[PDB]
Amino acid sequence: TALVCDNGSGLVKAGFAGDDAPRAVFPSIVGRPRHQGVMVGMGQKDSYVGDEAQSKRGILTLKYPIEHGIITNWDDMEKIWHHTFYNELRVAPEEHPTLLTEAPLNPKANREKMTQIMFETFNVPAMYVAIQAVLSLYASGRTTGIVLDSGDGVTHNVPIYEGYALPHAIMRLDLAGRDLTDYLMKILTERGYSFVTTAEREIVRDIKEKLCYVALDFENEMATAASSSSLEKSYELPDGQVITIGNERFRCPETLFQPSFIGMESAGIHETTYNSIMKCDIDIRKDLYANNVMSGGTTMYPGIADRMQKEITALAPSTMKIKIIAPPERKYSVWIGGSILASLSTFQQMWITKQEYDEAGPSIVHRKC
Amino acid sequence: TALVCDNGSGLVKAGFAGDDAPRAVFPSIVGRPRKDSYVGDEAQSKRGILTLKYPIEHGIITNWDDMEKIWHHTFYNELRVAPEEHPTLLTEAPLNPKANREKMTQIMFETFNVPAMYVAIQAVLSLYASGRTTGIVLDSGDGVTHNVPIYEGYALPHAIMRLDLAGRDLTDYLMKILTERGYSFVTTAEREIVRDIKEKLCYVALDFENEMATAASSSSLEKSYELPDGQVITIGNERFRCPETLFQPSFIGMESAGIHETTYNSIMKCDIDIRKDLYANNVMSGGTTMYPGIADRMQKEITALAPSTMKIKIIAPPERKYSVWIGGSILASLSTFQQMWITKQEYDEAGPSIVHR
Amino acid sequence: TALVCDNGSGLVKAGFAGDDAPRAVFPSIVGRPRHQGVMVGMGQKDSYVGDEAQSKRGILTLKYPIEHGIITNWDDMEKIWHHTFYNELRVAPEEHPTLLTEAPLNPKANREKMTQIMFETFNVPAMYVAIQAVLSLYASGRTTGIVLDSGDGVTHNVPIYEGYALPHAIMRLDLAGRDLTDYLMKILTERGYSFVTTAEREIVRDIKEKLCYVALDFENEMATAASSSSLEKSYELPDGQVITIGNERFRCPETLFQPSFIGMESAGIHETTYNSIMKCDIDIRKDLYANNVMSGGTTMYPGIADRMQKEITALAPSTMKIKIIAPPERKYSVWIGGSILASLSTFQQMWITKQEYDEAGPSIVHRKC
């Protein structure tokens, strides 16, 4: 079969084409010890990749090799791919073609270097690089719609009509889940809790998933929060301490709709989606309005579907119908579409073979993909 | 085999790798006239004409001329063992200067010419003896009381505590509270009796206020001890008040916090992700922690400090007095450690800097 | 003397009739603070207009009041007109009339609202609105020709023969310098440079004017860039960082000749020029061929005149001779023509007096101007 690896900014999802769920889902971090070793002959590792780092994170400096959807550390990225191909999938990469994903509007050297590593280090026989937003449309089983893919470093919109993509209407916002974690780390010190280290960033990310939510009306909710203590929630720290947050629950996800909280000048995701639709042709805006697909993990906040529907409804004309498609499996929608695409007879002639790479070099990926 | 020696503040242990107990342990003291030099139990006698000083006091050497005398005594006179024929494993102290370890490597490689050398932290060896990997070691000896937290074999030097209350000050404090009973123990010949009476009839009470009331209302807690000259004395509340100084250092006028507060402070200075594993592994070391009920007392004290959800376990092995030497004997016998010995050739090629491992 | 004002989409040019150069030229932006003031007193204002907004653009949200030759915000436009009359020209509009310009095929409310403001807010004694393309012919001293005024929001062609304008052959293209700046903004992301805020858009605009140029043959130039790095130029940002672009230099201006780069169905400027000539009478097509008066800021790219000459020649019969008239001062040809027109004794009857407006309302801009 063919591997379908979705190397995101926050998580790595590997598996085999033709399945329905990823086989390996682990954080994309590499940790190194920051203290000195004292015990004798313990076999203490100098680098931890994946779930090993998350279990020993109290004595490590966790670092993401991918930031904002761009691979900045290439020595660390080869370690993560080695962990995926050997310690997680337990396969020989020389026998399976690999399908990779990449966010739109990325540097041309980010995609070229992936081709060089896959073809010269792991010696795969074929490969292909796909766009994450296109793959999210395969999972939903539709050919017309606009995909809002919010992950850990990139929030991009891609409008597709009858299988045709419009590159001029593609947006890309660099506000995503990691920026929400950092913002929540800052608004927590107002209550007294100080989270600083990279290890404690993972703790705050845990608080964000369990408690944070999106309010339908931000102004009304803020008045309710201060009026009574009916919104406070208690979270227990790993060391037994109990912290309480009352209004930081809905202020952190509000950065998506009000990017001025983190000092950004760009508009919210609700306005960015409307802008992308208006850039398309007038005769295709009606179908794009009713087909709003959301993928990625950052689109999993409770109430984000109801909030997004209400905001776009005000901007759009009253005659038009607005529908937001939020499947419960939208976290793994990019991978599922990759498995569907890689399991198609027509796609079998679109792989980049080793022979083509041996004549045109790593620059063939732009012409083919 | 190898030679395992413990550089204790008051007692120096010696032996071979493989034994279940040190062969020769002596209260190492140096003596100089005020017959050229005296060291060990011999220097205890005729001490009036000798200069008795503590070399290792506060767990740091501070005197290299006296230190070489102790090592000379513990090999030629205590074991009848030639140092140049067998490797020697020494024990360092937590938070020790690199130059302090630097000189220790040079001294035996030149004066004694030992074939192989290795030095280990005393708190680490106490953790090795229990066979554990993660835990905070309360090493209470004769001069110092350390709190060394270790996680996955990675010590945290910024969270290592240090206290100056130990067994030596407990014995001296016992004298200051035994004079009001009519007994006079100024003379050093009677110091050993006070130390002996401390190791026999001293226990730590769970509730200090309740124990004080019991010892006064009724004579049930009173016990009798016979002095060597033939006189029998009875000690009342002194049985538990003297060990209470560890938890209440203000008894001897000190300002520092007790061992229960010192342990909690060291835990809170560690990373939040490793505090849970340190709560469940509280290892004991040294002979100052052989007071009955000390393990039960500190479990209650730390519990009131730690969060209610956290689980507290106090590990107090019955051989905690010799834990450091036992851990050294176990470590020197493992095949993994066999390749970590610092050979003489490595020292010659590089210098004293090899020991920085 | 009578004031002449050239209200452009990106630049404002003002001066007096009779002079040869505009008195004061400044960007047409109105920036407002987005951060929080913390210092006591200070010269902090509510809105900065013109150069004072370009100098403080780091902490302001720049907003162009005119887009695509249409005034969107009618309150920020009054600020710019007030800035021009009182702060830049330092004259009282009460004492002399003003000459205004407008793009062809514009909304009828654009002319009416401009007339109402001048006669009431500033109470000018008279006013007149002149077509920019007509004025550009005055500066060249010609009565027959076809103009290619390419500004910042609108590109248009107006054929004139012996002082007679042909309304049916008048063209208008909504592709201009601002769209080229946005296109260059997107294609700089392929090298890793991310410009997002409105302040950083001005930085990109400076790169376009200093580095971008027009290639004689697009296919030949593309191969040269890949063959060797003999077309790379470095640019120093205000931060001090050095950026390098070698292939984007001749691709951004190519959007004018190939509008499909930004996803548009319209033809290129060379094809639009040919279409305008064809719709005119056959007898006068010979004169228009050799009188291609090129003007506007966007037409200042090096080699654009040669490229237009080669393109039109291929479409035109070999017998006809194609001549491109590109004066070195074409950046202000619209203003210079207005200076010449307002200095004519025959033009004094064409002014719209205040008495006429009071008895006819703001609609008088159509019956005479």
Place this chain on the structure above:
Amino acid sequence: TALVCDNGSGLVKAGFAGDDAPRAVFPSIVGRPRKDSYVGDEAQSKRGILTLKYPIEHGIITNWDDMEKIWHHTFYNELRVAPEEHPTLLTEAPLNPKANREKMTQIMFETFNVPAMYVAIQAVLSLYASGRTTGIVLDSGDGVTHNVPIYEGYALPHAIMRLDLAGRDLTDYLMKILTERGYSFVTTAEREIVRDIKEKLCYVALDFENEMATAASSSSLEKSYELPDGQVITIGNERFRCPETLFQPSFIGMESAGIHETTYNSIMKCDIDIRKDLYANNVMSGGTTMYPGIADRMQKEITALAPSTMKIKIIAPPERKYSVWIGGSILASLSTFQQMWITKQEYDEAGPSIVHR
């Protein structure tokens, strides 16, 4: 005249506007018995019978019962002035919650009944002292360290950094490295002696590596300090190791980067059109930035991280220990500021929300 307050993490400075130095400077410590409470140096004198806890230890009040005692101790005892006649100007740390600044207005107008007041940011007042409106302020103090970028009077709260390493942590590290030489600095009385050693003998080396080699090979860097008991102690390389924790926070087990990289990171998080002006205006303030050579060291470190074409200028006025108070003293006396006092009449007609005016 109007009073000026400089509420700090470890030292408060009060006085009157128009002067050149604070009239009264005392520590911000309130201690309860372990005669209701003791504030300032009086609590430090009776430390043995009081629990010394700081309301501010990290810039934020977080204790509103102790500051009704510290403010009371300042006006009624330190300055000997009834607060109900002069308006007071209090300062607050950057990134302060809107509720914290709202609570000061509530306390002042009711508990103290001051005739109008004002709350200003500490970083802003440090810029007023140097007569600037554009720059980035490194306000290193006793409990926290901030990097506050200001451009033409408009702050950038999204780029304000915060480091919890300050002078208090440097004194503790100096205490630890002094034990390696055998000096026993344990009690809080000896901490004040250690504080005086740091303030008179510790400096910042231009480069750490070459100074280490020079110190280890010569005694020219050694300096002798005379203890209050007449003892003479000597410090060698420890002089430039205590302040080096500012640039290498890993010395005390902290993960964050030094003050040189924190400032550069703060600059790079601002708009690209304002970074050139922030590079040339680096204003230092606070007590901890008084080390000899910190300004020269900071310029060298930021220069490497910045592009070559840029120009870096560190602006350290000689009296930067009281820059925050001096800025408040200058600001209150100006006739322009006389119109922006938060008059008590406003606080009566409306709520305490007018503190955001």
